[PDB]
Amino acid sequence: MKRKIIYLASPYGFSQQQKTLLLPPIVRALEALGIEVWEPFARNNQIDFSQADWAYRVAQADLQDVKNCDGIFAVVNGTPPDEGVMVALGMAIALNKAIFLFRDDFRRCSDNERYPLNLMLFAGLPEIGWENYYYTSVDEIQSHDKALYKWLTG
Template identity: 60%
Template sequence: MTSKTIYLASPYGFSAQCKRLLIPEFVAALSQLGLTVWEPFERNGNVDTTKPGWAYRVAQQCMQDVRAADGVFAIVNGTPPDEGVMVEVGAAYALNKPVFLFRDDFRRCTDSDQYPLNLMLFAGLPASNWQEMVYDSVDAIQNRERPLGQWAQS
């Protein structure tokens, strides 16, 4: 069986400290499920930001990766979460890709008592038990009984 690819939508690559300390934890947890992780900061790491058009090329590559990946794992911390991550999640929903969310940020940014974030972030998740698709720790990501682990093995 070929391993599935998962696109790691994250704002953490913009910070050297987060890139060094946090991203590897997520990549390792997802890889332990047998997934091939596409981490966009690594995949676009050789971009020369002094050349005109670099941002457009990066955005196009990220969208191509979302289209080509089997699913998306999105880190949605912050109030509101990172705009680029939100675009990637929206694209994945439009492409009918499975999306798994990570949020360990206790702050709420919604008008809803039911959801911790903008309602549209939950539009592509199941109506009932959507909480199962939201992870709040790296340890939870590695749980093969949860939806991400089951999807990885299917």
């Protein structure tokens, strides 16, 4: 009955249009699985951007959310994936959080032939079956055959 907490890491807060139009459908798909979504652009609405220390406070606030999530859902679109998202993904791998990756961007940005992206993004995923954690469309988030659903049900 306690909802699992997902940190929703994305570059979508940087573009006015992307923040308005791309994130809400992703948040809704995750919430339809029963997830408690911590999305940092929304959770940092409160922070007083008129202070000189706002960037440091956002950094610490995001760090605490990653430490206290149960898993990360990392939007890794872009060439290359966003550096903020990557730092958060690294934190979550090191803290043994559950890892889920989302990329509906069909371009390749890779240093290898096994994975569609730089191999470091998959260090927290299994050698076999990592594709089950790798979502390629918003429509796929609901899938009972993929790893987010299975994680929530055991």
